[PDB]
């Protein structure tokens with residue numbers, strides 16, 4: 001294979017400042033904060049994921065390795081780690097949080113243009129991961145984050161290589177096999193998640209019954225807003241024969257074609273008269289000294 005020449009950047013604890021907590025969990029915690037490279041005259045918005053027990057520091061470093069190895073517009077890119085008593089991952093702050101919560105809170109303002117554009121953007125992200133011979137193994141709406149409403153990025157790699165049952169292929173649930181095509185399956189579930197505005201797939205059914213249900217030939221329903229054209233693509237992702245499933249490059253193509261005429265393929269009431277925040281808005285840039293702020297996407301080496 002060719003050699004992984006990614007640079008891992010070690011940052012000083014004084015070079016950035018946490019500002020608030022965004023969430024707490026098993027790992028530890030995630031802070032909204034600000035990274036000022038010393039002597040650079042830039043302030044960069046970041047998220048800071050911090051942890052201590054050795055056999056779990058190995059896991060955080062592993063995620064960091066993965067995330068330093070990727071560079072694509074639709075993959076959240078890591079900026080550096082900071083070595084203190086607890087390891088801390090510094091990555092580009094994604095201001096609107098996870099897409100799953102985003103569609104839940106904003107159902108009434110999400111148009112078909114936004115939906116299909118998301119579907120394209122993720123198909124691109126995953127196609128890039130496939131180029132980089134990477135398998136995600138945990139692709140879901142909870143693991144896509146929202147930079148702007150018009151820009152989402154894949155962001156959890158705590159399971160990537162070279163258990164979330166209701167998102168996984170059949171070969172994966174039964175034989176622990178994972179390939180790019182089982183990632184396609186989870187892409188299909190994800191799409192379902194979006195088109196149902198954050199619904200829970202197989203709500204109620206305990207994850208132990210999932211394997212046998214799928215075995216019989218049952219799948220998720222057709223979201224009300226879906227034409228058959230979109231639902232058919234979801235369904236092709238849920239074939240048993242993994243080679244019968246579409247390849248991410250084709251998913252990109254099909255959702256592109258659909259996102260040219262969005263209202264021919266998703267029927268939403270009040271569509272086209274809907275507004276979400278845009279970088280061409282007022283106050284769109286606040287979350288008090290934004291003098292010299294630069295989005296990470298534009299600070300390079």
Ligand SMILES: */C=C\C(=O)Nc1cccc(Nc2nc(Nc3cnn(CC)c3)nc3ccc(Cl)cc23)c1
Nearest residue numbers: 022023030047091092093094095096097098142155
């Ligand atoms: C989808 C599930 C979810 O909400 N996860 C969650 C909650 C809180 C914090 C994070 N991590 C995270 N957050 C941001 N920015 C953010 C904006 N609004 N919120 C609260 C909804 C969080 N940006 C990130 C960039 C990269 C990484 Cl790896 C994580 C985050 C996730």
